[PDB]
Structure formats: structure tokens, C-alpha cells
């Protein structure tokens, strides 16, 4: 009945907070690119608004004892020191040296970091109550205290006079660990929750997607099937997300409901009332409207609450080999196509076509990561452009969201991400990195990233000096004006280099 935690498992860390007088269960979150600091992701509201668990997922990489200064899936014990590697970025949860918190000032920031050298990235696990003691096994759903090895502070939910962040402070916070996947349950070519994938009519040679990264950002909401090069572009990528936190990263089965998120725009596949398909904002992505399922055929689910299996005895879904039928849970309708006598329209219907058979195709790590970096960049840069827009339209600088600091940080990360291989590498090694590089470039180009960079350049160029920008946007904005522009140019050069 009870579940322990072992090294190599994926987990999330949750706490409860009072927001507008009410309790919410939140995950410890962090983005790789563009800001290394931890923040929080609500999970309690999942039936109305789907949480993004990708930024919340950590692997317990090590679990060491007292005399120390992975192993074979050692079990977590109270009093052990742990290392948490962020799944999405390759980085680790660290107690940093900086203090961006006026509230406490004896608190240290907590964020992501790759330098794993000191003690800053180690945390010791401690009992919340008398019901657990040093040496005992940490159970799933145990309330935990985490203590930084370098700084002796608690992993702490801070009510910063604004609102909610995480830090390391001498006040404690109760965290509970939820399991996401097992480090010993292998992938083996099967569909796992959290996967980024493409959905194909294999025989028709096409994939489910949306209109190209061009005009009609509102137009980009519609859904259709398309053959050709789109099958190796970002816009045909979808992230499958289960409806629960626990085990959201294990094997998916026939009948098991899920949302499907369009990676590039971050919107969720949904059925409207007039019964047409449309991508919805996270804020409107309710279960009834966004929940779908795979079915081994179009027969009947009426066998009770008994596990569904294919024509072989296997309950899981295989990449490549399995034929799948997407069903909207709430209406029971099928995801089909319709001919408009390069592409054809995706629709929901009770009959369908005899060849609705979707084949699944796992995306590569490389293209998946890239697709996600694009979504972050577009989101951040759209805020930046909008903020710049309000300012030119005379809005009071204090009321405007202008993410100067994130923009500098993202551009640095982005430039690094497009850095060509240094000469001193072996020839075959350089060739490989040059290939990854071209792919990153192609995916960025197809998503219209060049025009977006040019758009940010143009908006900054309205101003004639740093001091002119300072006058409208404030001193700190003024002092990054030229460095942001330089970075924008550098990034733009990186996008086209070697074409």
C-alpha cells in the first residue's frame, strides 16, 4: 500500500499556501532559460486550469549519509542529504549566495545552477513530526522539512510583501513529495505521460498540427492535418499530460484521459460548444472541454470499470506499432478529418472515417527542448513588445510589465544556445554539433523568430539614446538598453550564421 522514494525517481515538491484567504497546493517550479530563480505552480486547480509539471520535475540524483565527504536505486532515508536535478534544464536546485528579498535579508535565494561543486546543491531531509525519525524510510505523502547543507536554512515558502516566492530562511516550511515516474520502469518504446510526440496518419503521411508561424496569431488556433516538411518542424509537436499529479510520468493506457498541449504556442486542444476544435489558453482549458483518450478501436467502453487492452493483451501504447483512436471523453466523439473539395481539416464526429488510425511518433530530445525554448522566448518577448507599446502610448511606467532583467538573461542563454562548436573539438564531434545547430536554427526560423527579434529591435530603436529610454522606462531599463540591443543583434546574427 505504501510507497518509498528511490534515487533516479522523478518527483515534484509541493507546499500549501493561502491565496486570497484560500488554500492551494503548489509545486516548486523553475525555468531553465531566462531566470534561474524558483517560483510556484498551482496544482490544486487542475480541473479548471492545467498546471505545467514540466518545470516542477526533479530527479533525486543522489542520497548520501553522514560520513559521506546512483548506487543502484537507494531508498530515501530521513537525515540523508539529497541532490535534485531539474528534469527540463540539466541544472540543480541550489541555495545561492544572493538575496533578492528585502522582507527577510537573512534569507538566501534558491534557484537552478549547474555548478555542483560545493555543498550549495545539497539538502538534508527531516521529519515534520514525531511520527518519523532519522534513519526511517521517507514515504510518499510524508510532510518533509528540507535543510540546505551549505547554509543551514530551510527550503522556505516566503510571503514577500508582494506575494509568493521560494527561498532559504530560518523559518520552516512543510513540503510533501509526489512521485512522477520510477527510475527502474524503462521506456522501451512505449507512451509515457509527459511525452512530446507527433500524431500521424501513417498511411496518409500527415500529422496533426496548426497554421504556420505567420500572420493570424488568433488564426493559429485552428487544427488540421498536414503532410510534408511540417513533420520535422516544431508546430506539429504536442505534449501529452495526464489529469493527475501522481505518476503523470509513467505508462499511458487505453481509456486513460489526458490533455494535449500544443508545445509551440502552449495552448490546449479543446472542443467548443458548436463542436469544433480550437486551441485554448491555459486559463480556459477545463477538463470537460480539453480531456481526450486513446482507444484501441471504435467499439464500446461498456465493460464496466475494467482496464482496456488491445488485440494482443498489452495494456500500454507502443510508438510506431500501435494504431490509436482519439476520443473526447465528455462527448464520446472521435477526432477525424474532413476533405475540403497540402492539408485537411481536423474535426470531431460520431462516425468518422475507417482510416482515422493515428500512429504515434516520439520526438527527439533535441527538437523537444528547442520547441520549448521557442515558447518561452515568444512569451517573454511578446510581454517585452507589449510593455514597450504601452510606454509609447503614455502609460505610467510603474503600471507596465517590462521584463528588462529576464530579457537580458534569456538573450544570454539564447546566444549560448546558438554558439558554434569550438575548433579544438574532434572532427566528427564538431560535425554533430553543427548538425544540432542547424536544426535549432531551422526550428527557430520556421516559427518566425527572426521577425520577432526584428520587432524587439525596432521597438527599442524608437528611442535615440539610453538616456531617452531611461526617461520613459526608468533608470534600470535605460542602463540595459544598449546591452539588450547588442544581444538582439548578436542573436539575430546567430540565427543566420552558416546558411
Q: HEC profile for 352-363?
A: CCCCCCEEEEEC
Rounded Cα distance, 314 and 368, in Å? 28
Q: All domains of the chain, ordered by start, with CATH?
A: 1-182 (2.80.10.50), 183-363 (2.80.10.50), 364-499 (1.25.10.30)
Cell 482549458 belongs to: 285
Residue 375's SS3 state is helix
In this structure, are residues 87 and 10 in contact, taking their beta carbons and an 8 Å threshold? yes
Chain breaks of the chain after residues with C–N above 2.5 Å? 69, 341
Q: Which residues have a Cβ under 8 Å from the Cβ of 335 and sit 6 or more positions away?
A: 277, 292, 325, 326, 327, 328, 346, 347, 348, 356, 358
What distances in angstroms separate CA 20 from CA 164, 266, 283, one per listed residue? Answer: 12, 27, 18
- Which DSSP string do the residues of 451-497 spell out, in sequence order? HHHHHHHHHHHTSSSHHHHHHHH-HHHHTTHHHHHHHHHHHHHHHHS
Residue 258, all three cell numbers = 489526458
Residue 6, all three cell numbers = 528511490
Phi-psi region of 283 (alpha: psi -120 to 50; beta: other; left: phi over 0): alpha
Rounded Cα distance, 415 and 438, in Å? 14
Compute the Cα dihedral for 378, 379, 380, 381 and give only its sign: positive
In this structure, are residues 364 and 231 in contact, taking their beta carbons and an 8 Å threshold? no
Rounded Cα distance, 366 and 305, in Å? 39
From which experimental method does this structure derive?
Answer: X-ray
Amino acid at each position: 500500500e505504501i510507497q518509498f522514494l528511490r534515487t533516479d525517481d522523478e518527483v515534484v515538491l509541493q507546499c500549501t499556501a493561502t491565496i486570497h484567504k484560500e488554500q492551494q497546493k503548489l509545486c516548486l517550479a523553475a525555468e531553465g532559460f531566462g531566470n534561474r530563480l524558483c517560483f510556484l505552480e498551482s496544482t490544486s486547480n487542475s480541473k479548471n486550469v492545467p498546471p505545467d509539471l514540466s518545470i516542477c520535475t526533479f530527479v533525486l540524483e543522489q542520497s548520501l549519509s553522514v560520513r559521506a565527504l546512483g548506487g543502484g536505486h537507494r531508498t530515501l532515508l530521513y537525515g540523508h542529504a539529497i541532490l535534485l536535478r531539474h528534469s527540463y534544464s540539466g541544472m540543480y536546485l541550489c541555495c545561492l549566495s544572493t538575496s533578492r528579498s528585502s522582507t527577510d535579508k537573512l534569507a538566501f535565494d534558491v534557484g537552478l545552477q549547474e555548478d555542483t561543486t560545493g555543498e550549495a546543491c545539497w539538502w538534508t531531509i527531516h521529519p515534520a513530526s514525531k511520527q518519523r525519525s532519522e534513519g526511517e524510510k521517507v514515504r510518499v505523502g510524508d510532510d518533509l522539512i528540507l535543510v540546505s547543507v551549505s547554509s543551514e536554512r530551510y527550503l522556505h515558502l516566503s510571503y514577500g510583501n508582494g506575494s509568493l516566492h521560494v527561498d532559504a530562511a530560518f523559518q520552516q516550511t512543510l513540503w510533501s513529495v509526489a512521485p512522477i515516474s520510477s527510475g527502474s520502469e524503462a521506456a522501451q518504446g512505449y507512451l509515457i505521460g509527459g511525452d512530446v510526440l507527433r500524431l500521424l496518419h501513417g498511411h496518409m503521411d500527415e500529422c496533426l498540427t496548426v497554421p504556420s508561424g505567420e500572420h493570424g496569431e488568433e488564426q493559429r488556433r485552428t487544427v488540421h492535418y498536414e503532410g510534408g516538411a511540417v513533420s520535422v518542424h516544431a508546430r506539429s509537436l504536442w505534449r501529452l499530460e495526464t489529469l493527475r499529479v501522481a505518476w503523470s510520468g509513467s505508462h499511458i493506457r487505453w481509456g486513460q484521459p489526458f490533455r494535449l498541449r500544443h508545445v509551440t504556442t502552449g495552448k490546449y486542444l479543446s472542443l467548443m460548444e458548436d463542436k469544433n476544435l480550437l486551441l485554448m489558453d491555459k486559463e480556459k482549458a477545463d477538463v470537460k472541454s480539453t480531456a481526450f483518450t486513446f482507444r484501441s478501436s471504435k467499439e464500446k467502453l461498456d465493460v464496466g470499470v475494467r482496464k482496456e487492452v488491445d488485440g494482443m493483451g498489452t495494456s500500454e501504447i507502443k510508438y510506431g506499432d500501435s494504431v490509436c483512436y482519439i476520443q473526447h471523453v465528455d462527448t464520446g466523439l472521435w477526432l477525424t478529418y474532413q476533405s475540403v473539395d497540402i492539408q485537411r481539416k481536423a474535426i470531431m464526429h460520431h462516425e468518422g472515417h475507417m482510416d482515422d488510425g493515428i500512429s504515434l511518433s516520439r520526438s527527439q530530445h533535441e527538437e523537444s527542448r528547442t520547441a520549448r525554448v521557442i515558447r518561452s522566448t515568444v512569451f517573454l518577448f511578446n510581454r517585452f513588445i507589449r510593455g514597450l507599446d504601452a510606454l509609447s502610448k503614455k502609460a505610467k511606467a510603474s503600471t507596465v510589465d517590462l521584463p528588462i532583467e529576464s530579457v537580458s538573461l534569456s538573450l544570454q542563454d539564447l546566444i549560448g544556445y546558438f554558439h558554434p562548436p569550438d575548433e579544438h573539438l574532434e572532427h566528427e564531434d564538431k560535425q554533430n554539433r553543427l548538425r544540432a545547430l542547424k536544426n535549432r536554427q531551422n526550428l527557430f526560423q520556421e516559427e518566425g523568430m527572426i521577425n520577432l527579434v526584428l520587432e524587439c529591435i525596432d521597438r527599442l530603436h524608437v528611442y535615440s539614446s539610453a538616456a531617452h529610454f531611461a526617461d520613459v522606462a526608468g533608470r534600470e531599463a535605460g542602463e540595459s538598453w544598449k546591452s539588450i540591443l547588442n544581444s538582439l543583434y548578436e542573436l539575430l546574427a546567430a540565427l543566420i550564421r552558416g546558411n
